[PDB]
Amino acid sequence: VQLVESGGGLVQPGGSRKLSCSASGFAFSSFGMHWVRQAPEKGLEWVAYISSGSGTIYYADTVKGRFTISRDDPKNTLFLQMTSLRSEDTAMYYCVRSIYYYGSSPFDFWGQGTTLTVSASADIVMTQATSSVPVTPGESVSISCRSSKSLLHSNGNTYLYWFLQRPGQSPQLLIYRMSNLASGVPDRFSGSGSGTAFTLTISRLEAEDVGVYYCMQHLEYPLTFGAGTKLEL
Amino acid sequence: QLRQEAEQLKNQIRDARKACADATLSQITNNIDPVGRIQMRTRRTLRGHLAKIYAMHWGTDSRLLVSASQDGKLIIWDSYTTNKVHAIPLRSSWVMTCAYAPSGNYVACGGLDNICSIYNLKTREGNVRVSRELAGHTGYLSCCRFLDDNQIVTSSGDTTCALWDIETGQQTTTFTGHTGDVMSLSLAPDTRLFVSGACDASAKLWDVREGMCRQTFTGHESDINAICFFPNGNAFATGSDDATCRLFDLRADQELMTYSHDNIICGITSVSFSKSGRLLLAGYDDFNCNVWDALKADRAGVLAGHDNRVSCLGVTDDGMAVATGSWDSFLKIWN
Amino acid sequence: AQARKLVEQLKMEANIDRIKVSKAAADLMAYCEAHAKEDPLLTPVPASENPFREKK
Amino acid sequence: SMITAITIMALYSIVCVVGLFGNFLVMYVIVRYTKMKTATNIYIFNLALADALATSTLPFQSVNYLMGTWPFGTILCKIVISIDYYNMFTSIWTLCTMSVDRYIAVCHPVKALDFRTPRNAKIINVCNWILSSAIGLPVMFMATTKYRQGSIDCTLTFSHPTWYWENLLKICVFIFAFIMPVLIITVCYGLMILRLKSVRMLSGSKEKDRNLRRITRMVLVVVAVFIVCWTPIHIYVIIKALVTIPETTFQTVSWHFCIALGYTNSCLNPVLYAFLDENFKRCFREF
Amino acid sequence: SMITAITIMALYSIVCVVGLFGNFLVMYVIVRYTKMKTATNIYIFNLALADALATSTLPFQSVNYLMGTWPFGTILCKIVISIDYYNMFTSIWTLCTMSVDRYIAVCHPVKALDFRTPRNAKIINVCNWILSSAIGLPVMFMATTKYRQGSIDCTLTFSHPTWYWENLLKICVFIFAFIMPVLIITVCYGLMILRLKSVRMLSGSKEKDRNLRRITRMVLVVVAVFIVCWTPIHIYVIIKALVTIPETTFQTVSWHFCIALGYTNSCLNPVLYAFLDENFKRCFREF
Amino acid sequence: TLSAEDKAAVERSKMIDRNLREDGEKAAREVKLLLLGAGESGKSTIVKQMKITGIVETHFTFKDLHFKMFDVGAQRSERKKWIHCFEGVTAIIFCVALSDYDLVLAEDEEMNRMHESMKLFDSICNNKWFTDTSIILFLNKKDLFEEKIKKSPLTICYPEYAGSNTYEEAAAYIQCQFEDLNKRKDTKEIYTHFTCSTDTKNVQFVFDAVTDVIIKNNLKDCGLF
Amino acid sequence: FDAVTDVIIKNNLKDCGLF
Amino acid sequence: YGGFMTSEKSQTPLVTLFKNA
Amino acid sequence: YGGFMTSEKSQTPLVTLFKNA
Ligand SMILES: CC(C)CCC[C@@H](C)[C@H]1CC[C@H]2[C@@H]3CC=C4C[C@@H](O)CC[C@]4(C)[C@H]3CC[C@]12C
Ligand SMILES: CC(C)CCC[C@@H](C)[C@H]1CC[C@H]2[C@@H]3CC=C4C[C@@H](O)CC[C@]4(C)[C@H]3CC[C@]12C
Ligand SMILES: CC(C)CCC[C@@H](C)[C@H]1CC[C@H]2[C@@H]3CC=C4C[C@@H](O)CC[C@]4(C)[C@H]3CC[C@]12C
Ligand SMILES: CC(C)CCC[C@@H](C)[C@H]1CC[C@H]2[C@@H]3CC=C4C[C@@H](O)CC[C@]4(C)[C@H]3CC[C@]12C
Ligand SMILES: CC(C)CCC[C@@H](C)[C@H]1CC[C@H]2[C@@H]3CC=C4C[C@@H](O)CC[C@]4(C)[C@H]3CC[C@]12C
Ligand SMILES: CC(C)CCC[C@@H](C)[C@H]1CC[C@H]2[C@@H]3CC=C4C[C@@H](O)CC[C@]4(C)[C@H]3CC[C@]12C
Ligand SMILES: CC(C)CCC[C@@H](C)[C@H]1CC[C@H]2[C@@H]3CC=C4C[C@@H](O)CC[C@]4(C)[C@H]3CC[C@]12C
Ligand SMILES: CC(C)CCC[C@@H](C)[C@H]1CC[C@H]2[C@@H]3CC=C4C[C@@H](O)CC[C@]4(C)[C@H]3CC[C@]12C
Ligand SMILES: CC(C)CCC[C@@H](C)[C@H]1CC[C@H]2[C@@H]3CC=C4C[C@@H](O)CC[C@]4(C)[C@H]3CC[C@]12C
Ligand SMILES: CC(C)CCC[C@@H](C)[C@H]1CC[C@H]2[C@@H]3CC=C4C[C@@H](O)CC[C@]4(C)[C@H]3CC[C@]12C
């Protein structure tokens, strides 16, 4: 499984740019795809989604009408055409593969990120109350997240996902649906809580766990992220 | 001389069984009130096979179920939402059994190709590919059941059973003894022992660790097609082509009870117990599935609605629903 | 060869400590009565509690 | 005069009642039990629908004959005339499509697999209905009511010159409803009977030869019923248009008898197709 | 090889140049002087326009034959095929309409007085173009370009099953463009000649009989040119569809010769209809 | 009502339904032939002619018609249990060798292999699962049978035949006995063709028998039968 | 009427231009 | 098909008997 | 009419002479 993006560099405002992400070593035709942007010294933000087979397409409202997503399955390539770029689009763009079925782990694998620089229903508001917590290796650490809408759906699933972005590396999924650990995550992390109040507990803090923690809702489109709690030493 | 000795020993075993029995189970259980009339409505109808179904197995999460069809497909189903979760194309179209692992990581299948195929479902790539090929049987694969994610018991049409190690790929234990094609097998909850029925009208209890036959149960007049343990692990019901069903106790080592009615002369394709074991569900060649009261030897209900020969039947782990598959290409869920 | 092994297998089958059938019957009835309440098939379960429900 | 009117009313009433009863019975048997899983069932259902509508438009014609005036109104006049011609072409072309289906099935078995599918049958049927609508819409717009001799008349209105458009429409309806369908049905079933004679399976055995005789008899009955029903009304319309004939009681009896004989094929289509069909026969036997 | 391609290219070039020159010359003569004040001149103008548009697609076919591939593109492929199929029917049905007009003009004078007007001819011509649009639109849609053996091919793609829709289109084009036009033209002109023989002003004298013989020869020339030109391409296409024939140079020469003759009839219709017409001849004498 | 993940799962189920429908149509077009006979019949030879463990699947295309032929000869298991799987088969091609009558299995009670083939054909033909299924009967080793009937009379194996030695008469008698083994003539045609070393002669006969079966199935589907 | 018919036939043929 | 063809039709006595009764 | 019918296409020598010229 590998995803690499091309088409970066500097762009003049009012211009146009096409990004392309090439996928290798997995069945590209069966995964839906996401574009997620990251401001330089701010949190992550969701841009767009395309289903497998191109049957449904979703966009953020700030990028509605300006950006066009497409996919070519025989060449295993995702394309993003961007027209009339603005000064807020100077961001690093990640591609995300996601499969949706009973027991699936979507948002499991993240791309590497292409930096682009141009200048050198009620929206569920996810609220990271804290911003930084200084921690020592060994103690159990608690991180709190809150929502503007109850994420407990009538089928019994609570659509909250916990992500960890290491400094200078691609972010990885830690927890999907607030109970199950993602494949490849150690059992140090645990998620708990209820509607409007969620908690991530890291017992037996170990090295390489220092990063930024994001809580994401996945109840309804558009996807809205959290601010991002950073840990440090 | 040796044959006469065998006749003598089996006569002694028959005399011991006769002398050991004192009171009939039907006489003891006559006092308890009958269950009455059990009517189960259809909840879900599953479509998309376009060929006859042979095997279904429930998962331990009581929600997903696997199904095997003659178009070369294994379909893994979400029973609550009616959506299809997986569709595995098979190398060999002819299929006669499919096992769903207790963890849910793997799915086994087999049939007339003499191969047991193990499919991994948790691959990172996301396409269900052939993980393990268990070649080595001489006859057709008739039943297979996972014990763990690494060990599997298979029965074959060369009159033998085998215990296979998945990661190695070699068979670790071979069970020989039956003269007829072993048609079915059932695992006990502790999984240390398993009983299997064959086309010699007998069932045999096999020890997984030791590898020998512990008990032998005779009494049927025709080929035994189906076998299933009682939920306590101390008894098992058998269904055969002689239009009768029987209940055998491991410790008693004799025929406890026989379930039969005069009108039905067709055979029994499959059998399964309820969570309490009070109800015994069995599908017949009369296009119906009969629910028998186990302790009263009387019919408790009738599941009609299949338009072709009912081939497979399974009660889920928590007992909340029963799923039946038939040759009409439909899976139905009763409750 | 085969006859010898079959005779030994039959003798091993014969040498078993068969308990009384009445005790097994009592255990079977006790197990059925104990698990009778738990069984959804034997005793009907409310529609709201039931995972399978009618869909409009 | 009175005896003639009673005979005409009895003939129209019997044809309409038997036709509606047979068509709705075929609809109920198809929808209730068979549930249109095969292409042949779809074609029989389409014949049932077209024949049902064509027979349903008949009592309004009977009331028009009795009263001598049209009191229903202009809009219902347009609806009745358009539905009448529309279902007439729909029924005849559906019969042609079934003839084409049986021809492809018998003579070209390898191509029958691709041709005989539910999807292709649905596409061809929808094309047939659209082709019937091709003439349904202009007849709809043209149809008006004219006040003549104190009586409202529900009739087609043709732009000047009236004779050219009126006879162009009579000639087009005559050609597309008679010349092409009789040729298609006769050629396809004749080649079908020849290919069935060529079949090695049917020949030789006396019982199988009797079965061949039964199939040939059924096919000839179908062709004969189609020709005997549709031929006199079309030829008599052509004779009336070409040569003016003085009005007589016998002319009135012959004209209405030809109309009833034209609707007799629509009435006799269920018994001929659905009931004689072995699958529906088995469904009737079981239930 | 080279001799064959030179012969085919020269034949297509001569037929295209003669057809375009004749069509544009006839249109220029009608528009600049006659001013389309008579129904017959309207029909001749529509016939010249249809033949010009049909002849216009011939160099694209010549380039397709020479290069062995289609380099123009998908859109122009759709436009050229649609114009070709549209104008073939437009030309042939315009010929049928002129035959019916002459039949009504001769046999039924009192009816011809109502029938022969500018307005009615405009209405019938608009109906003819709409009827041509009927066949034109699916041809415009279905036609695409397919990549085969490294060569782009401009052709019709048919939905599954391909054989059914393809042969149905061939049969319908064959019947509507050949069977009905030959019969209509032959019967109408034959009855026209039989009516003209009865006429007292035509017979009864030497020079009058010479004029009657001239009219009869003109009619026979028109009918013979129509039948002799359109018959080989249609019969050849039916034979090619029904019976597979091995590829030979003679097959290629015969195929392109039949196509060239089919276009040659459209090329030769302006000469017969306009230059041999006495009114245009008088216009040529005056100017 | 349904969540976004549930809607995506429904979309995945619809895509799976479309793929299964396409696979079902492709399987429906395919003509299935079941191959039966003895080991010495010549199954490998005739399969190699037509083409140019457990189930052996042979796939070949003739006149734009797909044939899948299932050779079940390898299995030694009891045929009664697994025979019901093959109910939906267009035709059964049963191959036997004419020269089998002289050959005698090495047993204490000397038995005629030809009579064993007769019992095999009687068991297959009278099976309840195969009442409307056509049988294409192939007789093998015609030249060796002609040489053998010239050298040795057919009276020695079974006394009932009393005709003079001739490949024609003897082969016709074996053919009519094989046809007489059928107990339901009305619902089962038997196509008997002497095997020869010509690719065109065999495959065309199989295509003709399959064509007749497709004609019969189409007539039953239309409802004339 | 017959003479008028002949004159109309002549005029129609002249309008067509066959004469 | 021919029911709606233009044909001058007189009123029948049966309709008069219906109106009377 | 028949120009767009599916037929075998072989590169003519004349277009080769044009390309050479
Ligand atoms: C537009 C209306 C007024 C006139 C045309 C009606 C047409 C569109 C209707 C009338 C009969 C209908 C068909 C009747 C039966 C079937 C079989 C069913 O399994 C699929 C739909 C199908 C094939 C219908 C398709 C639509 C249909 C052809
Ligand atoms: C596939 C076959 C059945 C299609 C046949 C279509 C024919 C019958 C239809 C289609 C176009 C129709 C014509 C359309 C317009 C007019 C003008 C109107 O003032 C008189 C009727 C008339 C002349 C129609 C007569 C019937 C007509 C010619
Ligand atoms: C274009 C094709 C499909 C149809 C052509 C129809 C033509 C040939 C038909 C339609 C209208 C017909 C005319 C209509 C009315 C009359 C009056 C009748 O007393 C003599 C024949 C005569 C004069 C017809 C001659 C033939 C005619 C012109
Ligand atoms: C509108 C009416 C006239 C159309 C009638 C079409 C009939 C006459 C034509 C069209 C298709 C033709 C068939 C097409 C193919 C074959 C196979 C060939 O090996 C023998 C002739 C045969 C069997 C033709 C017989 C005649 C046929 C059926
Ligand atoms: C061939 C067989 C099956 C059907 C024959 C139908 C046609 C040819 C028959 C049946 C009805 C007949 C018409 C009945 C009434 C009349 C009125 C009379 O004053 C002149 C003859 C005439 C006009 C007949 C002409 C021929 C006719 C139209
Ligand atoms: C519908 C599109 C595709 C094609 C349109 C074709 C028709 C409608 C066009 C093309 C040729 C046109 C005719 C050309 C010449 C004349 C003579 C003029 O004095 C009156 C208008 C009239 C009679 C035109 C009427 C409209 C016409 C018939
Ligand atoms: C009066 C006449 C000239 C009008 C035209 C009649 C004929 C040529 C028309 C009427 C119905 C038309 C058909 C209608 C539908 C289809 C399906 C499409 O996928 C292929 C073209 C095809 C098959 C058309 C071919 C042309 C067609 C057969
Ligand atoms: C064209 C329509 C309007 C009238 C004629 C309809 C029928 C008779 C025509 C239309 C389509 C034709 C079929 C189209 C293609 C083939 C393949 C050819 O190898 C054998 C004949 C066969 C199977 C034709 C048989 C006759 C056919 C079914
Ligand atoms: C080939 C089939 C489908 C169509 C045949 C069309 C032609 C041949 C038919 C249809 C309409 C017919 C015309 C209808 C009416 C008349 C009036 C009559 O007093 C003289 C003959 C005449 C003028 C006919 C001549 C032949 C005719 C033009
Ligand atoms: C009516 C008169 C004027 C013209 C008649 C033209 C027809 C009958 C002629 C002219 C061209 C001829 C074709 C020319 C070439 C071939 C290829 C040959 O391998 C088979 C015969 C065949 C297919 C001919 C069949 C008959 C044919 C189509």
Side-chain angles (χ1 to χ4, degrees), chain A residues 24-182:
Chain A
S24 66
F26 63 96
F28 179 78
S29 66
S30 66
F31 288 99
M33 291 297 168
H34 290 276
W35 287 102
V36 169
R37 69 183 180 180
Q38 184 178 2
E41 292 88 5
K42 290 187 286 185
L44 296 168
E45 186 177 1
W46 178 67
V47 174
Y49 166 69
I50 186 167
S51 179
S52 66
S54 296
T56 184
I57 294 169
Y58 293 99
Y59 295 107
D61 55 354
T62 61
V63 301
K64 180 64 67 68
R66 292 186 292 114
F67 292 170
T68 300
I69 191 169
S70 66
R71 61 184 294 164
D72 191 75
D73 291 331
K75 292 182 183 292
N76 296 320
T77 309
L78 188 69
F79 293 101
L80 183 63
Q81 182 67 42
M82 296 179 286
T83 305
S84 178
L85 292 174
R86 293 181 293 173
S87 296
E88 66 182 1
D89 291 331
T90 170
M92 186 179 288
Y93 294 172
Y94 294 98
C95 179
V96 181
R97 63 100 177 266
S98 295
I99 190 165
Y100 294 100
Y101 58 91
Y102 179 72
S104 66
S105 179
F107 294 94
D108 54 354
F109 186 76
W110 285 79
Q112 189 66 41
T114 174
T115 178
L116 189 142
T117 301
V118 295
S119 179
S121 296
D123 290 331
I124 298 169
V125 176
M126 302 302 290
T127 302
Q128 288 289 322
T130 186
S131 66
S132 179
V133 172
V135 295
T136 61
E139 65 183 1
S140 66
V141 181
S142 66
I143 298 168
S144 179
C145 179
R146 290 186 290 114
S147 178
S148 179
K149 185 176 174 66
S150 179
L151 294 175
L152 182 62
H153 194 269
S154 66
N155 56 4
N157 290 318
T158 302
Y159 297 100
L160 182 72
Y161 295 176
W162 290 96
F163 297 97
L164 175 60
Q165 184 177 3
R166 291 183 179 92
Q169 292 182 358
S170 296
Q172 66 180 359
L173 177 62
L174 292 179
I175 291 173
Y176 61 96
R177 288 192 294 271
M178 80 174 287
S179 65
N180 292 318
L181 293 173

Side-chain angles (χ1 to χ4, degrees), chain A residues 189-231:
Chain A
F189 298 98
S190 66
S192 179
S194 66
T196 320
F198 298 100
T199 303
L200 175 61
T201 61
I202 305 168
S203 296
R204 185 63 179 86
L205 184 62
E206 195 178 2
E208 200 179 1
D209 291 331
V210 176
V212 180
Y213 290 90
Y214 294 101
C215 58
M216 186 191 82
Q217 61 91 30
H218 197 274
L219 184 63
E220 63 184 1
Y221 292 100
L223 297 176
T224 60
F225 295 166
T229 299
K230 185 175 174 66
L231 292 178

Side-chain angles (χ1 to χ4, degrees), chain B residues 48 50 52 54 71 73 75 83-87 93-94 96 112-114 140 157 181 183 199 223 225 327, chain F residues 6 9-10 12-13 16-17 20 23-24 53-55 57 70 75 77-78 81-82 84-87 129:
Chain B
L50 280 74
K52 60 178 72 176
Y54 274 96
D71 56 351
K73 299 293 182 181
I75 301 170
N83 292 318
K84 294 181 176 67
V85 179
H86 290 287
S93 296
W94 306 100
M96 292 178 71
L112 293 175
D113 56 352
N114 301 328
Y140 65 96
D181 295 332
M183 293 299 291
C199 292
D223 297 332
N225 291 318
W327 290 357
Chain F
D6 290 331
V10 171
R12 181 178 175 88
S13 178
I16 290 170
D17 287 330
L20 289 175
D23 291 331
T53 62
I55 309 299
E57 294 179 354
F70 299 102
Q75 292 180 356
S77 66
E78 180 68 28
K81 289 296 181 182
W82 57 268
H84 74 279
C85 294
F86 294 96
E87 183 180 2
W129 298 103

